Amino acid sequence: AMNPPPPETSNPNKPKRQTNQLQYLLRVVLKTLWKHQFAWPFQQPVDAVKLNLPDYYKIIKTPMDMGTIKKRLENNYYWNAQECIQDFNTMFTNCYIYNKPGDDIVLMAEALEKLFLQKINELPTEE
Numbered sequence: 529a530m531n532p533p534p535p536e537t538s539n540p541n542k543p544k545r546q547t548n549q550l551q552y553l554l555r556v557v558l559k560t561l562w563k564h565q566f567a568w569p570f571q572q573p574v575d576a577v578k579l580n581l582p583d584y585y586k587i588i589k590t591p592m593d594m595g596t597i598k599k600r601l602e603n604n605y606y607w608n609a610q611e612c613i614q615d616f617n618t619m620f621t622n623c624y625i626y627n628k629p630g631d632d633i634v635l636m637a638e639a640l641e642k643l644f645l646q647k648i649n650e651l652p653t654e655e
């Protein structure tokens with residue numbers, strides 16, 4: 529009935545690097561999605577206690593959210609861009625798994641996803 533702790537966002541035992549793709553994912557992709565009118569439900573972990581959603585964490589075992597992704601990028605949590613992209617994909621997929629299709633939240637998720645997919649199509653060249 530308690531919320532789980534939020535996903536880890538900096539790990540001292542993990543190596544760190546900056547890459548152009550990672551920089552692009554923070555400066556361009558995340559920034560663009562964050563501003564979106566439908567972003568707000570995804571800007572932080574789902575507070576199942578405040579929302580009175582008792583089975584959210586019974587069902588969703590890999591929670592992810594853009595506030596967490598943002599923190600990860602800012603603390604150099606990801607070595608590879610694909611790690612960041614997978615986190616976004618997990619976020620959207622969770623929403624589809626938990627919610628009935630045609631729920632307001634699911635529709636907001638599709639809109640964000642469509643944008644996200646467009647943005648990662650423009651991802652810059654790897655070193």
Ligand SMILES: CCc1c(C(=O)Nc2cc(S(=O)(=O)N(CC)CC)ccc2O)[nH]c(C)c1C(C)=O
Pocket residue numbers: 568569570574575578579584622623626627633
């Ligand atoms: C529908 C639940 C949900 C949210 C979400 O955020 N809903 C939400 C947040 C606020 S809120 O942030 O205003 N509120 C809570 C702390 C107090 C300020 C207010 C109303 C809401 O419906 N995000 C996701 C991904 C889901 C699911 C279940 O998929």
